[PDB]
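[Discussion] Sanity-checking designs against the backbone

I'm trying to build intuition for which residues belong where. Below is a structure token string of 467 positions. I'd appreciate it if someone posts a full sequence so I can compare it with mine line by line.
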């Protein structure tokens, strides 16, 4: 109403957080333009076969550690969102042979232990690397170094173990991933090694909503955010920035003025042509944008006439050691989370995600049936009655699921990513210093971006030195 005006592009986690931090400081003249018809962004639930499941973020990652993960209190104490600790101690008993049945546990255990040791030496190595990133390498290069081979895990069991250890976490193979920025990982180093599966019918998005209703006006009766400051179905298509101020044009031809703009759209959106910047963003910034990775993590859901898979102690997570690396490999059954549901969850990432998103649900269901018959022969496995294939990559407002730190990108040029250009500020998981790719990362990045601008608006200090 009175003071500087900031336009926040996008009402995701970091978007909502940023505006909240801005409000708190006094900058209340905010306008949040959100492309979709809902806040939450990549924190989004949907109805699959009469239950609510997550399309996007599904875990609170990093719990029980030396520092409190800011999302965990909100999830466990404040909203008391239904969630369960994920236990992976029994994967050794649950790795399926490409053709028929499981491997000898004692065998698989060796391979897991071996894999863990190679990664532990990765940590030692990573701890010695110069902070300039000068002597950084891919996770694979390290793996090769320890295993004394021209290659990383090359055999069906080893690979699915490798996939589970890395791909299943970062949504890209070890060979594209920076050793120095994932091994070890601050998310786990700081907040603990535990991850917690949110399975609450309100949605994991309830966290975003909770935060949003601490500064945005909500209807006393229904609870729906009624604040005129949040505008849904507003698709920012052009940002005009000059010494004087900023213009923000949306897709319906509205043009807005403000003193500053906070961009919370994903790295993939920035990488696309969705938001045009006039004038064009400096080279240094563009090169930072296009060198970072916007990975794709696809959570394929399936429902079945009956339950043909093992349930009980250490049965939640099972692997499929395909000879075609990353082929329908990581499986999750929901006996605890959605009792009597008959839903399985297979995760694919990266190269496979792009294929699968592009093909018909039927074609996919077909492929998955085949695999499931091989995993459980001498059982009668019914065709899946329903399939869900989240198409995040294909979606213009996301163009991926989360960022991954790639080999080549050093700490400096990562900072160029978060750096502002004029009155154009950036936020989102991909700007998060130590927690890119994560809900908390997005959440904390909101606060940091906000504070950077607040420091400029109020304290009148606006030179940002990239480091
Ligand atoms: C499949 C998947 C699984 C994941 N797994 C985990 C996990 O379980 N645990 C965890 O901690 N994190 C995980 N994440 C990552 C986590 O979801 C993100 O780090 C976090 O949600 C990012 O929030 P954000 O505000 O940075 O981006 P977003 O949530 O994408 O916010 C951007 C918002 O801007 C909007 N938008 C984009 N373009 C425009 C525009 N042109 N105009 C106006 N609005 C625009 C979008 O609609 C969106 O609402 C997962 C993500 C996905 C999708
Ligand atoms: C979450 O809440 C439960 C049940 O109220 C409580 O016992 C526990 O302290 C919390 N769990 C974690 C991991 O913080």
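Best answer:
Here's mine. Compare freely.
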């Amino acid at each position: 109403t009175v003071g500087p005006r900031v336009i926040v592009v996008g009402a995701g986690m970091s978007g909502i957080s940023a505006a909240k931090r801005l409000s708190e400081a006094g900058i209340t003249d905010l306008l949040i333009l959100e492309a979709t018809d809902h806040i939450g962004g990549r924190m989004h639930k949907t109805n699959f076969a009469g239950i609510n499941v997550e399309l996007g973020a599904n875990w609170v990652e990093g719990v029980n550690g030396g520092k409190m993960n800011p999302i965990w209190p909100i999830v466990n104490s404040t909203l008391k969102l239904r969630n369960f600790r994920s236990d992976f101690d029994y994967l050794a008993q649950n790795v399926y042979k490409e053709d028929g049945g499981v491997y000898d546990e004692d065998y698989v255990q060796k391979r897991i232990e071996l894999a863990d040791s190679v990664e532990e030496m990765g940590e030692k190595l990573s701890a010695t690397l110069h902070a300039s990133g000068r002597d950084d390498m891919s996770i694979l290069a390290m793996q090769r170094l320890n295993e004394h081979q021209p290659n990383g895990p090359a055999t069906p069991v080893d690979m699915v173990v490798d996939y589970y250890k890395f791909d299943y976490e970062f949504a890209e193979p070890p060979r594209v991933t920076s050793l120095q920025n994932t091994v070890p990982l601050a998310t786990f180093s700081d907040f603990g090694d535990d991850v917690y599966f949110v399975a609450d019918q309100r949605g994991y998005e309830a966290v975003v909503y909770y935060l949003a209703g601490q500064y945005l006006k909500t209807d006393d009766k229904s609870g729906k955010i009624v604040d005129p400051r949040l505008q849904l179905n507003k698709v920012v298509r052009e940002i005009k920035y000059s010494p004087g101020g900023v213009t923000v044009k949306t897709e319906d031809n509205s043009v807005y003025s403000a003193d500053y703009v906070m961009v919370s759209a994903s790295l993939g959106v920035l990488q696309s042509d969705l938001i045009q910047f006039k004038p064009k963003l400096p080279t240094w910034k563009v090169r930072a944008i296009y060198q970072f990775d916007m990975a794709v993590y696809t959570m394929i859901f399936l429902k079945f006439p009956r339950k043909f898979w093992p349930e009980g102690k250490g049965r939640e997570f099972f692997l499929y050691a395909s000879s075609r690396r990353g082929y329908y490999g990581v499986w999750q059954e929901f006996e605890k989370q959605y009792p009597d549901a008959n839903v399985l969850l297979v995760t694919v990432t990266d190269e496979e995600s792009r294929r699968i998103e592009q093909q018909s649900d039927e074609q996919t269901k077909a492929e998955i049936m085949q695999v499931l018959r091989k995993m459980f022969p001498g059982k009668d496995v019914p065709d899946a009655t329903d399939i869900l294939v989240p198409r995040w990559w294909s979606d213009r407002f996301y163009k991926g699921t989360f960022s991954n730190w790639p080999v080549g990108v050093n700490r400096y040029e990562y900072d160029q990513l978060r750096a502002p250009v004029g009155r154009v500020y950036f936020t989102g998981e991909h700007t998060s210093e130590h927690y890119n790719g994560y809900v908390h990362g997005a959440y904390l990045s909101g606060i940091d971006s906000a504070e950077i601008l607040i420091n400029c608006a109020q304290k009148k200090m606006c030179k940002y030195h990239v480091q």
